[PDB]
Design a protein around this ligand. Structure first.
Ligand SMILES: [Cl-]
Ligand SMILES: [Cl-]
Ligand SMILES: [Cl-]
Ligand SMILES: [Cl-]
Ligand SMILES: [Cl-]
Ligand SMILES: [Cl-]
Ligand SMILES: [Cl-]
Ligand SMILES: [Cl-]
Ligand SMILES: [Mg+2]
Ligand SMILES: [Mg+2]
Ligand SMILES: [Mg+2]
Ligand SMILES: [Mg+2]
Lengths: 294, 295, 294, 295
């Protein structure tokens, strides 16, 4: 479970000017994560523009990430969908594929009941052998998967973790009370992730890790070892990035930041995501200098 | 004249058999029901039609099925919402020269674009079709709130003609009206506040309740357009338990059960992740139907 | 009931540099409201710094307002308290006093139940002959008096009106359905007040009326006569004031605006209220020019 | 040393007879209970003590009664909150040279001052006393949220020593700690999250639950201060139904009933606008007391 703990990068999907996926930028990013202690890469999640990649593109990008990784770092596939049949289909695409697990978000827009969530994730789980990381982010989905529901789903053998993005830190022990000792809790909120780990969480699926991979890996290791004062000093250096990478909707700011650091050639996104505004750019650039990255 | 875009427009359920396959015989009944009862237009494969769980192709086939069954007797508006601009375009192109009268297109959900992103999204969609576009704002589902200033910018585009405003924030009526021409159409997307929305100057409602109270909703809208607000309020009071309790569980779980209870559809089957109505919800909806004098 | 409908001013309590109440400024304000068609004056409400006037000062300021009014305009006393015994006592202070009615807010800070609200307002009502205007403003009090509770209280003979400050316009017909035809609904939210009246409300207890009394009186009359297009043209001229009088906490901006228009000598407030900041001042000044008042 | 300002501090009820008069015999029992069971300090005439419905003079008399009954056996902290700065000063001056160890002072409620207003409010209060001041942030009651930056500014004043942070927003712990010296004290004002708050670096809790579980709360706080978080969590799990259900109706309605049920007070009478616990609430609190093994 080393691959499901610590600093896991919510990896950008780098694009050329046309919005086509850039293989050479992907190679650079993956090499960067291997070199700097990132525990694993989430491919085609939220920060990877899952929304504007086709069902097919999803597949290709994950397989490209897998190929470039070449066994040097674990890859987790983003496989969320708001229709259970589509989530199953996305999941089946990666059976026997070399990915180590899947990251699967609560259905968005249609606002299912907690029983609908249970049935959704149960069906997905039953259609694969792969480890499943649940993902709760009500600010994007309009659905809040409550702890009791997480508890029910944790009983399923291949439902192994949750990415809890609410920033509501009381959830850590609410979930822990209901699940086995080996169930994995991951922060989905960079600004509160160190707090989350100090309370008993096991890592973070991180946007900040895109541009501060070594610092994020170090902070998570320090936190795992109970060296909270030391972890906090790193967290303070990164706090402006934890906040300002969301000055405009993720991943607009983090793609610009990758560009500014030389990690990707362009910060192009696909509509409806837009290029960072001047005002946002100046703010991110300042945060990057506060962190000593630029 | 703009009548196909005003009054009571039904957010039509997509009826299914027990395997979750679309039921053509049920859709025939529903459409005949709306023809017979004063419904202005049918939204096909919108939110209440389980757009989320119909494939790209099914979006197409179910809208065409509905048009074929309407047989020119009632206008049909296609739900063409997507959170990727390229997908919204593709969905919209499917209906160019189809007989549908317009498209209902929701703000991108989940990815939370900026207002400029919204502007560019809807501008691109509008530029790839001749069909009239009805914008749709529902932040409680999308995580994105399209502000009145942004609606104003979009309303300058020739084929962006209307907004389905679902927030239930009634201040939006005149905030939008202040920014748009007098022919731009405002539609409620919140049944419980829709009469209020019309009394303030709105032009109609894209309605869930209208699935099971089509004549009543059509009458209420006509009265409100005529300034007959006391008469309209009497209908609204009769319907208010439905306006609320059709959301006791996530739409369209309650309204599909209610269609079944009234004999409009054969089954109330939904596709996962939507679930059959609970006993608790069912008893509540049944009571609201009886309050409305429909059961 | 003319005195409980139309444009009712939430009157500032003007002060000197020391925070003492300025009689001469009060005279000027009251003369202004007589001359410009204001239906009534609320004395020592929220905009009048009820919070930082003593139980005694409350009394004096209301009696001074009454004396300066000299029968030319009705005066309504702010008599809200979060303890029922204190609300009773404040109310009894004005029995046989010449005030036409009282404005009484839901208890703040202690967050009573709806039954606690019912009992609070019932006791107050039973201890006076004066008309009672309920006041709901959950953003300040932490208590939301729901329509059903308003309905129950409207059955009491001297509970005659509600100042509904939520800006939630669905409340108009929710309340109307539950009360007699003669119960009075007043907006407590200037930005939405014209909407509120268009839906069937009878007036507004207004901050904007402090600096645009004639315009507010006209808009309310137009609205009462069903001349909504004409009312709307006035509302558009005033909208920047409806919003920017709250650029900093009311009544910081409106007191500066009274000062800028020559209605009061100083814009001094009592702590914890603070002088308007430069940034707020510029914004209010601009709103006043948009309205053609400055 | 700072011990009177850390650990389990009780937000003590003000016990009343059936006419709503303060009951001295009941307060004696409560205070003896807290002496006997490890409570660090007593907050007298705070939020749970019905500060809102005690007069200015009663604020004074009840705090002095409590000090007299404590008889130097447990420290007493006076609630001195007011939404007018001049009133907070007057309330605070009442205790200069009284034997109380400090004051608990809430952000002004209802009038919604700016952060600078908060700064000036608390600065003026602090300048008119030698007593240590514990700031109190509870936006759900006040309509005002004192931000961490403002707490940092105030913490520079010599006799502003602590904050009771009631938001349950656990990110505030290190946001405040980053801005204040290492001797500034952070106390939870949210029983349900208080252990989490302490695990993150908080120093204690001003607690409602401690009214009916004083020994348990004292033990949990001691364990958390010692880093014994698993042992502390076991107590927290036992108490969590109380931490929640003591707010099933507005505090202090439930906790006064619970004191009565446990024989700590003679009556659970409150002053209007607070009301006797409903049957529904009573059954819920009784069940939580039984879950905690206190009844
Ligand atoms: Cl992700
Ligand atoms: Cl979230
Ligand atoms: Cl729809
Ligand atoms: Cl919404
Ligand atoms: Cl007022
Ligand atoms: Cl409010
Ligand atoms: Cl307290
Ligand atoms: Cl709070
Ligand atoms: Mg730009
Ligand atoms: Mg069932
Ligand atoms: Mg200043
Ligand atoms: Mg009772």
């Amino acid at each position: 479970n080393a691959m499901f703990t610590g600093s896991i990068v919510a990896l950008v999907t780098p694009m050329d000017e046309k919005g086509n996926v850039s293989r050479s930028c992907l190679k650079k990013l993956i090499d960067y994560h291997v070199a700097n202690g990132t525990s694993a890469i989430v491919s085609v999640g939220t920060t990877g523009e899952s929304a504007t990649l086709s069902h097919d593109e999803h597949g290709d990008v994950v397989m490209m990430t897998l190929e470039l990784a070449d066994g040097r770092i674990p890859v987790i596939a983003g496989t969320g969908a708001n229709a259970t049949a589509e989530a199953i289909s996305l999941t089946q695409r990666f059976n026997d594929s070399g990915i180590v697990g899947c990251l699967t978000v609560t259905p968005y827009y249609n606002r299912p009941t907690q029983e609908g969530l249970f049935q959704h994730f149960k069906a997905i789980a039953e259609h694969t052998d792969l480890p499943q990381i649940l993902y709760n982010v009500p600010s994007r989905t309009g659905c809040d998967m409550l702890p009791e529901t997480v508890g029910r789903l944790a009983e399923i053998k291949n439902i192994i973790a949750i990415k809890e993005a609410t920033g509501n830190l009381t959830r850590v022990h609410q979930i822990k009370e209901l699940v086995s000792d080996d169930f994995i809790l991951l922060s989905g909120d960079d600004a509160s992730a160190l707090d989350f780990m100090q309370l008993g969480g096991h890592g973070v699926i991180s946007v900040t890790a895109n541009v501060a991979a070594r610092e994020m890996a170090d902070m998570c290791k320090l936190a795992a070892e109970g060296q909270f004062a030391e972890a906090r000093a790193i967290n303070q250096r990164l706090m402006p990035l934890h906040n300002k990478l969301f000055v405009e909707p993720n991943p607009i700011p983090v793609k610009w930041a990758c560009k500014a650091l030389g990690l990707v050639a362009t910060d192009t996104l696909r509509l409806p995501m837009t290029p960072i505004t001047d005002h946002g750019r100046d703010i991110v650039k300042a945060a990057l200098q506060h962190a000593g990255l630029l």
